[PDB]
Amino acid sequence: GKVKSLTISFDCSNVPVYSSGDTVSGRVNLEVTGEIRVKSLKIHARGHAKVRWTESTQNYTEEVEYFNHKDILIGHERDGFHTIHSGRHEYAFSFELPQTPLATSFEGRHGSVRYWVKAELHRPWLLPVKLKKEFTVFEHIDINLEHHH
Numbered sequence: 621g622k623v624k625s626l627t628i629s630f631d632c633s634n635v636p637v638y639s640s641g642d643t644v645s646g647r648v649n650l651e652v653t654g655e656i657r658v659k660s661l662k663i664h665a666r667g668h669a670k671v672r673w674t675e676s677t678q679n680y681t682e683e684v685e686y687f688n689h690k691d692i693l694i695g696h697e698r699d700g701f702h703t704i705h706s707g708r709h710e711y712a713f714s715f716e717l718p719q720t721p722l723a724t725s726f727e728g729r730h731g732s733v734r735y736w737v738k739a740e741l742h743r744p745w746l747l748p749v750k751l752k753k754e755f756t757v758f759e760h761i762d763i764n765l766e767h768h769h
Contacts, residue, residue: 621654621706628739628753638735639761641719647710648693648739656704659742660695663713664688666738667757669723671731681731686722689715699742713737717757724759733757 630636630646638644648661667686672679693711695702723733735757741749 621652621656621704623650623652623656623741623749625649625651626739626741626749626751628737628751630753630755635756637756637758637761638717639758640717640722642717643714644717644737644755645712645714646737647712650704650709650711650741651707652704652709653706655706657744658695658702658704659700659744660697660702660740661693661711662690662697662740662742663693664690664738664740665715665736667717667722667733667735669731669733673730686735687718691715695742701744722757722759725754725756 627649628646629649630644636644644665648663650661666688668683669686670681670683672681674680691713693713694700694704725735726733734754736752736754738750738752740751743749
């Protein structure tokens with residue numbers, strides 16, 4: 621069998637922008653011909669900030685992780701032998717972002733803030749296939765409140 625395509629998509633028009641408290645939902649999309657044996661399909665979602673600065677002249681950098689979510693969508697972490705059959709497969713995933721403040725996605729001279737989901741397809745006697753896809757976070761969008769009578 622052969623993996624013909626492996627992609628990540630985010631469920632939503634515009635591309636979804638996320639913020640504190642939001643659920644990020646998406647899928648790992650896999651197209652296969654024939655059959656393939658897999659150990660696991662894993663996802664790893666992460667948000668982090670990295671910054672750079674100079675001091676009289678020794679250069680420094682600092683990193684902070686905002687969250688780190690891991691999930692096994694197929695198989696088992698041990699290194700299961702699940703079989704993916706001919707056709708198209710969309711493996712759903714979802715996770716919730718922290719409710720506390722999250723820095724806006726950013727790339728600049730002095731540093732960056734990045735959020736992403738990484739998918740890993742692990743197969744017997746083969747190197748993992750790894751794919752990353754960024755998603756955009758805004759610190760401030762629209763705070764939804766509810767009122768009751």
